[PDB]
Design a protein around this ligand. Sequence first.
Ligand SMILES: Cc1cc2nc3c(=O)[nH]c(=O)nc-3n(C[C@H](O)[C@H](O)[C@H](O)COP(=O)(O)O)c2cc1C
Ligand SMILES: Cc1cc2nc3c(=O)[nH]c(=O)nc-3n(C[C@H](O)[C@H](O)[C@H](O)COP(=O)(O)O)c2cc1C
Ligand SMILES: Cc1cc2nc3c(=O)[nH]c(=O)nc-3n(C[C@H](O)[C@H](O)[C@H](O)COP(=O)(O)O)c2cc1C
Ligand SMILES: Cc1cc2nc3c(=O)[nH]c(=O)nc-3n(C[C@H](O)[C@H](O)[C@H](O)COP(=O)(O)O)c2cc1C
Lengths: 353, 353, 353, 353
Amino acid sequence: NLFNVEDYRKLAQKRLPKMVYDYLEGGAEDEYGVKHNRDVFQQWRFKPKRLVDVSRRSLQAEVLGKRQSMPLLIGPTGLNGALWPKGDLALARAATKAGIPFVLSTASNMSIEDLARQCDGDLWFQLYVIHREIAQGMVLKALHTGYTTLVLTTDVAVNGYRERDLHNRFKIPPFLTLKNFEGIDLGKMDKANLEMQAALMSRQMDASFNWEALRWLRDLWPHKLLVKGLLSAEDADRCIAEGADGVILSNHGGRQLDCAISPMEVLAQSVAKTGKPVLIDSGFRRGSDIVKALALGAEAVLLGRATLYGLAARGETGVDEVLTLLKADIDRTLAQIGCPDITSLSPDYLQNE
Amino acid sequence: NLFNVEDYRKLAQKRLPKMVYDYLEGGAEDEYGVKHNRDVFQQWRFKPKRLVDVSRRSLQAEVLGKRQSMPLLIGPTGLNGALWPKGDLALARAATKAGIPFVLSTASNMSIEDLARQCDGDLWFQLYVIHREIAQGMVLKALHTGYTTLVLTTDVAVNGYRERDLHNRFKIPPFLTLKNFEGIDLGKMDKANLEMQAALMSRQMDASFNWEALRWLRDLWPHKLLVKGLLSAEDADRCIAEGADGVILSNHGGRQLDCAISPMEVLAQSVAKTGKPVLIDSGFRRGSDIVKALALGAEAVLLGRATLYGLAARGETGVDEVLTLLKADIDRTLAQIGCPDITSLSPDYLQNE
Amino acid sequence: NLFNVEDYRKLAQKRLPKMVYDYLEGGAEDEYGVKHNRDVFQQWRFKPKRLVDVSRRSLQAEVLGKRQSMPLLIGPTGLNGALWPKGDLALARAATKAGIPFVLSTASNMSIEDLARQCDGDLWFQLYVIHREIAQGMVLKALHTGYTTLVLTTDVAVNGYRERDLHNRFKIPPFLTLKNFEGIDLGKMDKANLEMQAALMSRQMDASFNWEALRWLRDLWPHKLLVKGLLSAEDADRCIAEGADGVILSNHGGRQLDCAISPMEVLAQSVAKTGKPVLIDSGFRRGSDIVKALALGAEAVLLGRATLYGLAARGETGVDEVLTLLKADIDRTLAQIGCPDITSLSPDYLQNE
Amino acid sequence: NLFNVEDYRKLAQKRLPKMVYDYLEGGAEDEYGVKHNRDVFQQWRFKPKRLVDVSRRSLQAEVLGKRQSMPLLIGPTGLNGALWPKGDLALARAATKAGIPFVLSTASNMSIEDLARQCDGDLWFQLYVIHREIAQGMVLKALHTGYTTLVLTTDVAVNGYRERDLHNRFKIPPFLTLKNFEGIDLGKMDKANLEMQAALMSRQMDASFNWEALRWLRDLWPHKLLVKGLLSAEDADRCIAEGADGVILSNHGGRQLDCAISPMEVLAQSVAKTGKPVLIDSGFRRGSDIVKALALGAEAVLLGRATLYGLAARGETGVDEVLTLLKADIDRTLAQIGCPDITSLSPDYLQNE
Ligand SMILES: Cc1cc2nc3c(=O)[nH]c(=O)nc-3n(C[C@H](O)[C@H](O)[C@H](O)COP(=O)(O)O)c2cc1C
Ligand SMILES: Cc1cc2nc3c(=O)[nH]c(=O)nc-3n(C[C@H](O)[C@H](O)[C@H](O)COP(=O)(O)O)c2cc1C
Ligand SMILES: Cc1cc2nc3c(=O)[nH]c(=O)nc-3n(C[C@H](O)[C@H](O)[C@H](O)COP(=O)(O)O)c2cc1C
Ligand SMILES: Cc1cc2nc3c(=O)[nH]c(=O)nc-3n(C[C@H](O)[C@H](O)[C@H](O)COP(=O)(O)O)c2cc1C
C-alpha cells in the first residue's frame, strides 16, 4: 500500500538499515520538535467555498518570479547517497520531471559540476560555510555550472544533539563521498592552506558567519539568494534589508533545536513584514499541510523527509511517486476548498483552531 | 447489549464484511476529521434549569414550516443496499414510522419512483449533478412522484481520498444498483447522448456546478430547496440570497476533506446571519450532541451513520430501534436540562468549555 | 495499602460484587461527566503563603451558622445497605464521631425514625418527591424526630441513563428495604390512596415539582432548607429568593446527565451572587479538591462516593478511616499553603490554570 | 548510553534498591506536581536569532555578585549518603571541579565542619529550623567554617505526603547519619535541653517560623541570605523587604504539595517585582529548561534530582558527567539560539505557547 507519504516512510523503514533510518527520521533530543512540527498543522482547519467552478484547476505558480508546475521544491538534504545509490541524481531527475526545482546540498554525494552535467532541470545550490575561501569556491562553481539560485543555510552553527545517532554510534557510510570538498589541495603550507585544512578536518561550520558575512556572500552571488533556517519575522526582514531575495523559514526538520518553534508560527508575520518571497519547510507530509502554508502566504514549500522516503524506498521512481501523490493531493484539496487556482489561496479558506 | 448508537456500531461491525464496514465507517485520509466531528461536541456542556415542570414534554417541531415528531431526519446516504437488502426502503419505513423525513440519495439502490410507490412518508430527494440534463430528469421525476423537498449536495466536486477503500480495493458491490441512472438510453449519437454517456461512465460529478447553476436548479424545483455541504455562514447566506429555503451545514461525515471544520463551528453564526432554517449533520451520535445543536439554533439534525448502524446490524427493525433510543435520549435530556418543549431550546442551556 | 480515598476504592472493588460496584462507581452514558468532575480540579493550582505561623491550625467551621469539626458532610446516598449491612447507621455514626453532619436519603434502607433513635449526631434529611402527600409525611416525620436540616434534591426529575446498570440488568438487592415508604396503606380506594399507589409503584419522581412547589415545601419545613442539584448561579439565587437558606451545587456525581458542567464551574459565581451558603459536591476525592472549593467560597463539601468506598470496603471503621485521612489531608494542605485557619481560605491561595 | 540526564535516571534506577529509588524519584500524592514541573517548560519555545557570531561563547555569570563558571548550582538535598557513599562530598567535589556552588543540607550525612575541611569550593548551607537554639548553632558553625551563603528552606512546615514511601514503609537507612545533630547533649534537665530534646525526637520542623523569625535569622547571618521555597512574587518581595539578598522559587521538586504551581509560573513576575536575584529549581532536566528560566530572568538554576541521578548511578564521576553534559547542553543551546553570552539572555528568545 503506497497511497501517501506515511506509506513510503513505512516502506523506507523496512528497506533501510536501522541506523540509517534513525539518522534520517531522528530529531534533536526528546524529539518534541519533530512532533510539534506535525501537530502545529492542526491549529488550522479548512472552511471550503462551495458552488465554485473547480472543473479547471491550476497548480502552476511563480517562485521568485519564475513559473514552475507547483509550489513545491525538493529541499537540500546531505548524504542522499546513503539512502539510495546516486540519490542526488535520482531526486534531481524526479524534481525535473515534476517541473519543480531541486536543491543540492553542500554535503551532497554528487558534485555540483556532475549534477549540472547530468540534469537540465532548475538546480539550486545550498551553501554551508566551513571556510570562507572554500565556500567562495563552491559558490563560483555553482555559478559557472548553471545553478539559478543560492540558498545559505544558517541553522547549523553547531551540530544538533541527535541522540539516536549517539546511541547507534552513527558514522557517515564508507562508500559515501563529501564530493564538493574533493581535491582541495594540502602539501601547501601556510596560514591558509593550513587554517583551511584545520577547518575541513572539523565536523563543525563557521559559527562566526554573521550579517557582515551575508553582505559578503550577497556581493559574490549575482542571482537569486535566499537565507534558510530563519524562525522570526525580524530575522527574515533583516535578510531582505541585507540583500536577500527571499527567505526559507525552517527549523531544519526538528534536527537542530528540539524546542524551536515551528516556522508555521511566524509564517503570516514574515509574509506581512518582509513583502518578499517567504518559502518554508519542516513537518510537511500531507497536501493539506502544504495548502495551509500557501494560504498563509508562503511562496512555496520545500520537501525534506517526504521525498527522501520515496528515495529510500524505491529510488528515483519512488520520488516520482511521492511527487505524483502530493500533486494529486494538493489538486484534490484545492477542488475541495473551492480554490481552483493555487495562486488564489488566502487566509480566508482557513479557520484558526 | 443494544442501549445506544455505539452498541449498534459494534454489532454492525460484526455482521458486515470488513471492506463494507470500512467503506461505511471510514473517513478521508488520516481520519482526524471524523474524530474532530465527535470531539467538537465536548466544547459545550449543559447548565440545567432546575425546578421546571417537565412532567409534560414535547419533541414535536416544525422543519421548513412542516411539523414532524422530532427535529431529526434520516439523511441521504448512497448504496444503502450494500448494508442491508432493500436498505433504502427499510430506512424510509423506519423514518416514516418515527414521524420524520427520509432523504433518498441520487446514488440509491432503489429508484425515486419505486420508493415513492412503496412508502407514504415525507420523502426528500438529494441531488448529485453529474450531467445537467440527467439531473433535470431526476428532479422532475422526484417532483412528479411526490417528493416534498430537494437537497443539493455540493461537497463532492471531486471524490474524497478515503484510504481504507484504497487499501481494500473497495468496489461497489455487484448485486448493487445505481437505479436512478437506469435505462438512460445509448445507441444515440451526438454531442449529448455522447457527452452525457461520457459523464455517466465517470465516477466524478460536475465540478463546474456553481452559483449560476444553483439559480438554474432553483427555477426548476417549485418546492422547498436546501443546499447541503456548507461550512461557512457566508456560503449559507449566499444560498439564501440565491433562492434556497434553508441549508444543511455539513462536512459529509468527515468523508471528503479531513481537515474541514466541523459544521458545529459555524452553526450559531449561520443561524444569526441567514435568518432561515439551518439544518446540520456530521458527527451526531448521542442525544446530547443533537440537543446541543438545536440549542445553538439548528432547525434539525440529519443522521448519517447512526441509523446506518441500525440498518447494517438489524435491518428496518434496527433503524426503528436506533430512532427509538435517540428519541428517548433527546426526551430524557430535555427533562434533565429543564426544557420540556424542544422548541424552547436556546444557548442559555449551554456552557462553552 | 490504605493511604487515600483511591486505595479504598480499590479495596471496595475487590469486596463488592461486580454489579454492585458498577452501580456505585458508574456514571451516565459515556461517563465523560465523572471524568470531567475529577479533571476540573486541575484548573486550579496552589500559591502557598510562606513564613506564616501554622503551628496551630483549625479546621473548625460554621455551616449554616452551626459549628462543626470540619467543612465536610457525608452526603445523601440511597441504598447504602447494598454496600454494607446497616450502611446508613455506619455512615451516620462515623460522621458523628468525626463531628460532622450525615444526610439520610429518602431511598435509605434504614428509616428516618430508626436512625434518629440510634444516632445522636447532627442528622439531615434529603427529600425526593414522588407523591406530595407522602413527601409531606416524611418531612414531618423528620421534623418530629430531630432532623435539623432538610435538603431537597432536584436533579432526578427522570432517571439517569447509566449504561453499566443496563448491561448488568441491575436490580435493587432483595435483602434491601426502601424503609421510608414502609406501611403506607392500600386497600383504600379512591383518587388518592390510588393516585398515590400509582406513583409509588413507579421508579420515577414528581417531574412537575417546580418553584411553586418549593414555596409549598418552604412553608412546611420550619428549620434550615437547602436545595440540592443546582448548576447555575441564577438557579441558586432564585432558590434563595424563594426562601432557601442555602444551596448545594451538584451534578449528582455524574450519575444523571453526562454532559452537565461540574458545579466547580459556577461555584465562585454562585457565592458572589447569592450571598448565602453555597455547599458543593461531585468529584471530591483529595483534600486539595476540598480546599480548592472552600477557597473559592464553598461553605462545605459533601462526600458521596469517597466515604462509600470506606463503607463498602470496611464498614463503619472504613468510613472512620476515610474521614480521618481526609481530615489529616485538609489539615496538611492548610499548613502547606500557609492558611492555618480554614475559615481564612480565599481565592488568593489559588492560581487559575 | 549516557548522553543526557534521563539516561542517568535509568542507570540510577537499576543500581538503587527500589525503595531508595522511590524515595528519590517520588513526589507528593498523585505526582501530578512532578509531572507539571516537567510539562510547564513546554509553555515556551525558542525563536533563535540567526547570523549572530557565536564562535566565542561564555557561560560565565555572576550569582549574588560572585562570578562562577555557569548559572547552575547543586542544590540542597538531604540523606545523600543513602544514594552513594559520602554522597555529600562527591557532590561538593564535582560542583567545585565544575566551578559552581554546592549547597549542604541540614539533613546531610556529612557535617558542616567535615565538608568545609575536605572541600575548598564555594559552599552554601541550607537551614531547616526544628529548634531555634539548635538552628543558631548550625548557622554560626557554618559561618565559622567558611560557608559563603545561607539558604533558609521554608516549604516543609509539615512533611509532604509521599505515598511511595508509605507503601514501602520507607525508613531512613541505618548506616545513615543526621550528622549535624550529632553530640547535642541530654542528661540536662530543664525547659530547654528538654524542650529541645522533644523537638529533635520529632520528624517535624518549626511550623511557627514566620516573618518575625526571618528577621531574627537575618541579624544572625552576616553574609548573603536567600529564602527558598517561595511560589509567589509577593512572598519573594516580602523576603527582600525583610532583608533577604535574593530568593529561590521552588516547590521542592513536587515533593511537598502536589497541586502547587511550578515556580516557572511566577518567575518573570518575581524578577520584575523584586529587582533582586531570583534563583529557581524544580523540574530542570534539559539545558533548554535551564536556558528558558535564565531567559525569563532567573539568576541561576539549582539542580536537585538531575545530579543525584549521576551520584546514585556513578558517584562523584557520575555527578561530573552530568554537569559536563548539562554544560555542553547549555552551551549548544546558546549557540543555536544566537545568544553567545549567557548573560545576554532575555525573553526575546522565547515564544509563549
Ligand atoms: C537526512 C537529512 C539531511 C539534511 N541535510 C541538510 C543539508 O545538507 N543542508 C540543509 O540546508 N538542510 C538539510 N536538512 C534539512 C532540510 O533541508 C529541511 O529543512 C528539513 O528536512 C525539513 O523538514 P522535514 O524533513 O519535516 O520536511 C536535512 C534533513 C534531513 C531529514
Ligand atoms: C456510507 C455513506 C454514504 C453517503 N452517501 C451520501 C450520498 O449519496 N449523498 C449525500 O448527500 N451525502 C452522503 N453521505 C453523507 C451523509 O449525508 C451525511 O453528511 C454524513 O453521514 C453525516 O455524518 P455522520 O455519518 O457522522 O452522521 C454519506 C455518508 C455515509 C456514512
Ligand atoms: C450510590 C450512590 C447513590 C446516590 N443516591 C442519592 C440519593 O438517594 N439522594 C441524593 O440526593 N443524592 C444521591 N446521590 C448523589 C450524592 O448525593 C452526591 O451528589 C454525589 O455522590 C457526589 O459525587 P461524588 O460521588 O463524586 O462525591 C448518590 C450517589 C451515589 C454514588
Ligand atoms: C532526595 C531529595 C532530598 C531533598 N532534601 C532537601 C533538603 O534537605 N533541603 C532542601 O532545602 N531541599 C531539599 N530537597 C529539594 C531540593 O532542594 C530541590 O528543591 C528539588 O530537588 C528541585 O527539583 P528537582 O528534583 O526536579 O530538580 C530534596 C529533593 C530530593 C529529590
